[PDB]
A paper describes a structure:
We have previously identified an SDR from Serratia marcescens BCRC 10948 (SmSDR) that was able to convert 1-(3-hydroxyphenyl)-2-(methylamino) ethanone (HPMAE) into (R)-PE. SmSDR is a 3-oxoacyl-acyl-carrier-protein (OACP) reductase of the classical SDR subfamily that catalyzes the reduction of its authentic substrate, OACP, to (3 R)-3-hydroxy-ACP, participating in the fourth step of 16-carbon palmate biosynthesis. Each subunit is intertwined to form an α/β/α-fold barrel, of which the seven-β-stranded central sheet is flanked by six α-helices on either side, showing a nucleotide-binding Rossmann scaffold. Two phenylalanines, Phe98 from the β4–α4 loop (residues 94–107) and Phe202 from the α7 helix, face toward each other, thus constituting a bridge structure over the top of the binding pocket.
The structure of the double-tyrosine-substituted mutant F98YF202Y was solved to 1.47 Å, revealing a clear electron density map of the mutated tyrosines. A close-up view of the region between residues 98 and 202 showed that there is significant conformational alteration: (1) no contacts between residues 98 and 202 in F98AF202L [Cβ(Ala98)–Cδ1(Leu202): 9.81 Å; Cβ(Ala98)−Cδ2(Leu202): 11.39 Å] and in F98LF202L [Cδ1(Leu98)–Cδ2(Leu202): 9.20 Å and Cδ2(Leu98)–Cδ1(Leu202): 9.33 Å]; and (2) an additional H bond between the hydroxyl groups of Y98 and Y202 in F98YF202Y [hydroxyl O(Tyr98)–O(Tyr202): 3.10 Å]. Thus, the replacement of the bulky aromatic chain with a shorter side chain at the region of residue 98 greatly led to the loss of the hydrophobic contacts between two arms. Conversely, F98YF202Y that introduces an additional hydroxyl group on the phenyl side chain creates a strong H bond. As compared with the wild-type enzyme, F98Y and F98YF202Y had an increased thermal shift (2.08 and 1.28 °C). There was a lower Km value for F98Y, F98YF202L and F98YF202Y, indicating an increased binding affinity with substrate. The F98YF202Y mutation that introduces an extra H bond seems to strengthen the conformation rigidity, hence resulting in an increased HPMAE affinity. Yet, a lower kcat value of F98YF202Y implicated that this mutation might restrict subsequent catalytic events possibly due to its inflexibility. Structural comparison indicated relatively low RMSD values among these structures [apo vs. F98AF202L: 0.11 Å (223 Cα atoms); apo vs. F98YF202Y: 0.14 Å (234 Cα atoms); and apo vs. F98LF202L·NADPH: 0.14 Å (226 Cα atoms)].
Author numbering:
A (entry chain A), B (entry chain A): 5 to 249
C (entry chain B), D (entry chain B): 5 to 40, 51 to 191, 209 to 249
The structure:
């Protein structure tokens, strides 16, 4: 239980990758607060998974487009569990549109979920974080490799995380808080499933030939959140099957 | 006159780097439309510099925080000069604040000038651009090297350009339009002058030991805008005195 | 014991980071052969120490094959040999150039090739690079940094070659063992990252250059 | 003639990109010596062609010094020698490994060192790398990519060493001469980028790896 006694906050913990992160951090001993945007039933089920197995959980409904909500959610977590040790930012909107076609609203949307709320959650978490803590952003391999049209704003929003990570690492390093950007490739989720033609075409660009699993992302995040990873900071860390080789 | 007959649009052309870009592109033969946010007198003087020397110019007052304004400015340029060949995005806000201290408004501000309006100007320019055109974003070496605290959101906003550039290059490549991100280091301007203690400390991190000059940035932008640079696309191109080595 | 039943080869496993890597892999249940014709081992033990130098391609090849004779095909190779010699561009001796190329670059490929000839599908190759591949703040490091940035291309291309066999290939980039965290790293932290990548949870990480540098390169 | 009065050395200047580089630099007014004990030149001319191979460090050193005897200290060195041999990790012959290391890596440092010994302040060193240092989409390229990603660290560190002399050091990364633009590049486009970096407007560009690849690496 490498995270016994620790308190983690997961922005977007109710489904896919975020649910697996919640469950792995709890399995390792952390008490976990997480936000969900949509489904109370889904969040209830993730919470139960933490509890049936002996872990402590708080689910918080919050819209990641609303900065006030995110700040309120962090404060509510800290009232529930005490100061944070770990923040994982996993809100994320993957929408395609060409440069000449994308609507001004889908843009301003990926900006608010994928960039602005990552900063806002990080700032409020840092204000309530123990020294020796961990902040992990979930970016994308499209920060490094954009093989097709339609991903310009999505890739912009994820490469934003590279400079955020570097500069936050400098800010928070004197507190011994690490800041890292985990860059996944394709991962099998219910809205991006490993199925169909587009999945086959993506697999052809990967050295591994398969989609990643939610639990593999969660295993990397849990390593970075743990006691062996205090020297890892400022980094953009690819876990992408070789997509970006 | 490698740009004879060409039409360029410069977002932020009235001062510093943007004024030097305007003057160099006009000197090479382009007709230049440029936006300015603040000073009609400054913009009038840049316009005169283009004209006294025999070039064609249009100055447009526009707030780079206002997407409608930027779209209107591009349309007004195209009515004045015809379809664009070149877009240079040089709006830019360099504000420092630690992660735990930066105000929600300074953040949402660097986001609007340094990220969102670069996309918005690019989209509207692309809709009115000839094939074989050029789009040049002005990013920063802080996308690659963040040596001190206080630059997290600034560096986020500039590393955003890396993925924008890659994805826009894919979108616009079939039109033979190149898309590049010029990443300057410190440059001697009236608001960031090569003078004082902070300038000396920055120079110590540079291999060159001096600030860059506005005309050196303009020379690189003019090369990238020209007829010898049609193979350069998707790139993030450092011109930083070795800051980021 | 996440590495129970697995077989590892560590090039440069006799002190510092290399010794911490050998210790950690063995503690997780791997058989470990390492370099640092002579060998030492313990009866009933699963750690084999081989003295052979990282300069001669036939020797290094032979050491790999010795390990396979003891233990079977490899699952894990870690390339951790490394020579660090400072010199300005105008002054560096050609013999120092040649030593850094032979140890830091050529021996990495030689060991990787031999390992790949005798490796189970689902294996792991981990190169030990440096954060100097990304940030070179001072003079004197040009050829050292060159030798370490070489591993970035090697990793990418080796990941493409070996991916059809489900073998991952990554480049771990340490910093000192400029800093954002205010201390140097510990050998055991570098070993814990290599052990993670060597294990069963890390099959989707490939082709990557992964920095563990205290924020040196930020 | 932005290079009037300047002296350039081009390692590998006899065909393709190298020949386009020699032509462009000379057209801008430079004296140009290039490699491709024998030499040819024209009476009254400022282009000197030297046959010496990019393998032997004393020879390459000698060619540089020959150029300095004709023309004076250098202002510009362009390293454009290059060997491209495909082979998977498991199969590549060690002699092909060794040839790519000697030509693509070691000869780049040897020429750079000799040039730096005989170079005016305010000079320029330009290495010709490859976009394969950043994107390796297919198998077969591991050692080629390794040899070319080596130049990234070299460039960074050489920029730090030579910056006090105002000498810039950059790495030009071509693509084919995956694509975003839908054609391969022309030799003369690579030469125009090298000429820009070699000129008087480019003194603030240093340490950089600068891609000219049609968007291959995007």
């Amino acid at each position: 239980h490498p995270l016994q006694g620790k308190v983690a906050f997961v922005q977007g913990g109710s489904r896919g990758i975020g649910a697996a992160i919640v469950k792995r951090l709890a399995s390792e001993g952390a008490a976990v607060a997480f936000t969900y945007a949509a489904s109370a039933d889904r969040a209830e089920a993730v919470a139960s998974a933490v509890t049936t197995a002996g872990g402590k959980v708080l689910a918080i409904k919050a819209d990641s487009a609303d900065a006030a909500a995110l700040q309120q959610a962090v404060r509510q977590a800290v009232s529930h569990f005490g100061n944070l040790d770990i923040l994982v930012n996993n809100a994320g909107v993957y929408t395609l549109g060409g440069t000449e076609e994308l609507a001004l609203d889908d843009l301003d949307r990926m900006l608010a979920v994928n960039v602005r709320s990552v900063f806002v959650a990080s700032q409020e978490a840092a204000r309530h974080m123990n020294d020796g803590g961990r902040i992990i952003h979930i970016g994308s391999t499209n920060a490094e490799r954009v093989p097709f049209g339609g991903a310009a704003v999505y890739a912009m929003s994820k490469s934003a995380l590279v400079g955020l990570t570097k500069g936050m690492a400098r800010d928070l390093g004197p507190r011994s808080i690490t800041v890292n950007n985990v860059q996944p490739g394709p991962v099998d989720t219910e809205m991006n499933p490993d199925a169909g033609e587009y999945a086959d075409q993506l697999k052809q660009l990967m050295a591994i030939g398969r989609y990643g699993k939610d639990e593999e992302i969660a295993g990397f995040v849990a390593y970075l959140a743990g006691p062996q990873a205090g020297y890892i900071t400022g980094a953009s860390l690819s876990i992408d099957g070789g997509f970006s080789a």
